[PDB]
Design a protein around this ligand. Structure first.
Ligand SMILES: O=C(O)[C@H]1CNC[C@@H](O)[C@@H]1O
Ligand SMILES: O=C(O)[C@H]1CNC[C@@H](O)[C@@H]1O
Lengths: 594, 602
């Protein structure tokens, strides 16, 4: 059960003061000596939220593998006596264990979604409370994403993994205490059915075993459009949420007990999404995706959320004419999807299940020789995977801006076990939520004649790098390979085709008369050639450029101080292909394919 | 009366949530049609804290001159019934006017120090209250810093100013509502006297509004070491753990404000430390100290001068790594988080007002008009510029009075002191500052072309602060001639004043990546040679007790043929990557013993 806390007759004290106390645990004796009982000795100030890696300009902290300890004091507001008090972490990347003054509150494996707990019997209103959080950043074969910790014969752990971005960790998002009465709306699901945009229904389902519920549908002018009294349904008149506007009704659910009362406001976007034939229909009209795969990657904070960075990246995506993006390779911060709700941005929401593939040269030992096996990606990783889809859906269900779930990124689907693995996951997800199409984004070398699993999904998502990783430098042959491959998919599946990734590394400042790789002239010619090919194949309904910005990776001979396929630098300065994308994307009609 | 909000039987609701509503006012009718009365129209989301300029990647918001509108709703807690509620803005840059549901509560001009208002009579506990703020970013001759707003024929205003950083504006630090009981400690002043490091007296004086006071002084182990009574006139005798550069041991002063019915307790951090200028030495706890480090800026990539916690932790990691022990709040007061950090980690800090650009002889700044023909006149820098300047000195001292890390007040930065009337202006504010805070030495930072033969006002101050660029702006490229000019100038300054000499700005513009076998201007090799030549001169002049490299990091300036996308004299880049010179400084500042002048050897 998860909703984003709001303020009303429910309160919140945001505890991301910044400046917790922080210390490594190189000897792995924190839990044994129970460091949560006292103040951490030999600690230093750390900023919350933000990754602990890049915060101290220290190579030993940055590449650290083990447990790290956060700690902070905080006075509980005296006006909270007799309320339910919830300690919420919006994200603790990979693993957290929480103590409130010698008492353990909660522990969570899965570093991108919230976890909260009821802390009433362990705090008294008005006195100071100590919170210790033991964060762990290790990946093994049953974490999402997977990884492999290797120890030397001397005892220092080095982490290996199989995805392209760097393995930042720490407290990445909001820690907050929020209160609620002891009669409290705990969960609301709303499904919205449309059919020629003139009168449509909002089925309701909501759970609070603590009180009886009234529901009342407000509009943007705070005037009531419908009312009902769990398992509700309301019928309404026309003004849909559309990728242009993003008109949001606001549905206040009241939970009445005789003694107490609780009001929770949930914003509803009224619209439909459905795949038919080769079309991706938003409110029964075909839609053409444009935009980026992104990353939560910033200069000094790592993957730490930041409001200024959010406003400025959306100013850039607005200027460049993108209507859509994909939360590439892990669930994003919540405010991202709240912003897309208000501004009508289409989002592909995606689980952290990346790196199920031992055949890439990206992302940092001796790896197992068959991927699907006990040794790696066994039954326990399948259920850990499924738990990640449950948590992601449970968090983002009501968001209108999420038009599609992506259960995994670039899995190796050639060995079997790939289908024996992904078939139950696609079916569990489809029943967890049937209001949105389902996809799995497919890696390049699993071409149309080789991949095993994409007929279990609704939309086909392709990451193609012809002219980069294969046919390197030759736009002409890469053109012909590209335009032979997507026609091959179209005949095979007759599904909508989104190219969720296409991009080439580009050094900001490298200019060439010869249009060769790494130069800005090549990123321009490359993107345009992919565009010529997209426009001639009817089945492609979306383009998303690989990354919007340069981002940090693990060290390697293939990554010049990071992944450089950005349209913008890590500084968010535009490479000269930003004006290529702005000109094409804003010249087209909104949401419609050239 | 100014105090840092703390949480001890007192509560705060940080309204920094960012994502306020934001709107410009190009027709300048927001005051006319009463924009605070309803929700801002055609607004957009803005992050707070943070300058508004670089946030939307649009030049016409960036160079906007006029009023900006922020707006936000906030639910006010039920359990603050019998409590006093205060709305506080730790910085609204330049001018800010606030409305609490159609009622103006506050108004402030001064972009870098906090202002607050008591909001109890217009707030209902439990109901949502809407907060509208009108911010202005204009500078005239009686603002600090000064400037000239230039109207074209169509009413579009362009701001010209005379300082070398961009004029970022908006709500730059943290906006909060906090409580207090209706009996409350409103101001504390603490002075600490040192007598050869064995026993000392902490003069206390407190202005509680509404109660008798006891004080209690606790150590780092929270054990009581001294008690006292009375609204003031508390002086406590210790056998102490001094606040030292390097460690920064902080006692704790618990001030009790007890009335008949209510109670209020405020914990103020107290560093036991004495600062004194004796001879050509700057003594901290009666020992000669050598400053190393930086002039800084509150400047980052997309938040402008917006405060940020990751950025503060990382920059202190770097300043600790490179061996710096000091810095100067270059050109405006910094956030209090910065000076609280310096208090904890024993970092020596020169505090500075915003009085920069009292000089119309520099190519620095924005030149979008015609500058006045005389700086010290009724048209520019008049008696009201002097009162605004005094006001800025009082607010600055009123906030940082008890920070042990502050060792000096900087009244102004590089004023032009050749014209008569520079002393008619600066003498009264120098004595008024000494009457505001007589426990810390006083300085004014001296511009390069006011040499020892020409400067008129430096004898009014305790420490001589120099900004020199020989071999850059003059004798360009010529290291061997520059060495002679610099050593001649520094020996002249010492002989004329016999004050301590801190070089608060020396640096050269340096493109990261530009390398040269000829050690040319703008190359990383030049930066290195230039810094090291300056260092050989310093080490030969006894009166020099400090070196502060001009900037820690590259920062944004206004457009001009002298500023390649900003000022590039940083040791680090804007995204905090080290230039070659960073390893030069690290070898010097970590090779010296801590806090002591290199004896011309190694
Ligand atoms: O090679 C690339 O740049 C991309 C290929 N597909 C997956 C991405 O994580 C990766 O970054
Ligand atoms: O020109 C420079 O680089 C510096 C000269 N002295 C004043 C500073 O504000 C300025 O940044």
């Amino acid at each position: 059960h998860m909703l984003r806390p709001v303020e009303t007759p429910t309160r919140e004290i945001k505890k991301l003061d910044g400046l917790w106390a922080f210390s490594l645990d190189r000897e792995n004796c924190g839990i044994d000596q129970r460091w949560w009982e006292s103040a951490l000795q030999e600690s230093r100030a750390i900023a919350v939220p933000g990754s602990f890696n890049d915060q101290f300009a220290d190579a030993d902290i940055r590449n650290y593998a083990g447990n790290v300890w956060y700690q902070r004091e905080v006075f509980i507001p005296k006006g909270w006596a007799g309320q339910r008090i919830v300690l919420r972490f919006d994200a603790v990347t990979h693993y957290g264990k929480v103590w409130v003054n010698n008492q353990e509150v909660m522990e969570h494996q899965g570093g991108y979604t919230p976890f909260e707990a009821d802390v009433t019997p362990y705090v008294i209103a008005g006195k100071s409370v100590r919170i210790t959080v033991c964060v762990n950043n290790e990946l093994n074969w049953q974490t999402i994403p997977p990884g492999m910790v290797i120890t030397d014969e001397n005892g220092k752990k080095k982490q290996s993994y199989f995805h392209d971005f760097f393995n930042y960790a720490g407290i990445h998002r909001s820690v907050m205490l929020y209160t609620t009465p002891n009669t409290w709306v705990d969960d609301i699901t709303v499904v919205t059915h449309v059919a020629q945009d003139c009168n449509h229904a909002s089925v309701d389902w909501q759970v609070v075993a603590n009180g009886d519920v009234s529901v009342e549908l407000r509009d943007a002018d705070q005037q009531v459009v419908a009312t009902g009294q769990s398992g509700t349904l309301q019928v309404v008149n026309p003004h849909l949420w559309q990728p242009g506007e993003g008109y949001l009704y606001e549905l206040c659910v009241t939970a009445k007990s005789q003694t107490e009362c609780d009001i929770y406001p949930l914003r509803v976007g009224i619209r439909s999404v459905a795949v038919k034939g080769e079309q991706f229909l938003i409110n029964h009209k075909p839609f053409y995706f444009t935009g980026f795969g992104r990353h939560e990657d910033a200069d000094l904070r790592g993957k730490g959320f930041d409001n200024v960075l959010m406003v400025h990246d959306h100013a850039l995506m607005d200027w460049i004419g993108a209507n859509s993006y994909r939360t590439s390779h892990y669930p994003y911060a919540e405010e991202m999807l709240d912003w897309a709700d208000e501004h009508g941005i289409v989002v592909i929401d995606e689980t952290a299940a990346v790196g199920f593939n031992l055949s890439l040269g990206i992302g940092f030992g001796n790896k197992p020789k068959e991927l699907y096996s006990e040794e790696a990606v066994n039954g326990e990783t399948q259920q850990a995977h499924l738990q990640a889809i449950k948590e992601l859906i449970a968090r983002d269900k009501n968001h209108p801006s999420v038009v599609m779930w992506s259960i995994a990124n670039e899995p190796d689907t050639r060995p079997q076990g790939a289908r024996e693995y992904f078939a139950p996951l696609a079916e569990a997800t489809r029943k967890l939520d049937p209001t949105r199409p389902i996809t799995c984004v497919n890696v390049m070398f699993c071409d149309a004649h080789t991949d095993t699993i994409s007929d279990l999904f609704d939309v086909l998502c392709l990451n193609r790098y012809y002219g980069w990783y294969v046919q390197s430098g030759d736009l002409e042959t890469a053109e012909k390979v590209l335009e032979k491959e997507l026609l091959a998919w179209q005949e095979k599946l007759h599904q909508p085709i989104i190219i969720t990734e296409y991009g080439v590394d580009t050094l900001a400042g490298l200019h060439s008369m010869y249009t060769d790789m790494w130069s800005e002239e090549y990123q321009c010619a490359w993107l345009d050639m992919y565009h010529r090919v997209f426009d001639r194949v009817s089945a492609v309904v979306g383009e998303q450029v690989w990354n919007f910005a340069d981002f940090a990776t693990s060290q390697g001979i293939l990554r010049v101080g990071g992944n450089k396929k950005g349209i913008f630098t890590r500084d968010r300065k535009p490479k000269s292909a930003a004006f290529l994308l702005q000109k094409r994307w804003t010249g087209m009609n909104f949401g419609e394919k050239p």
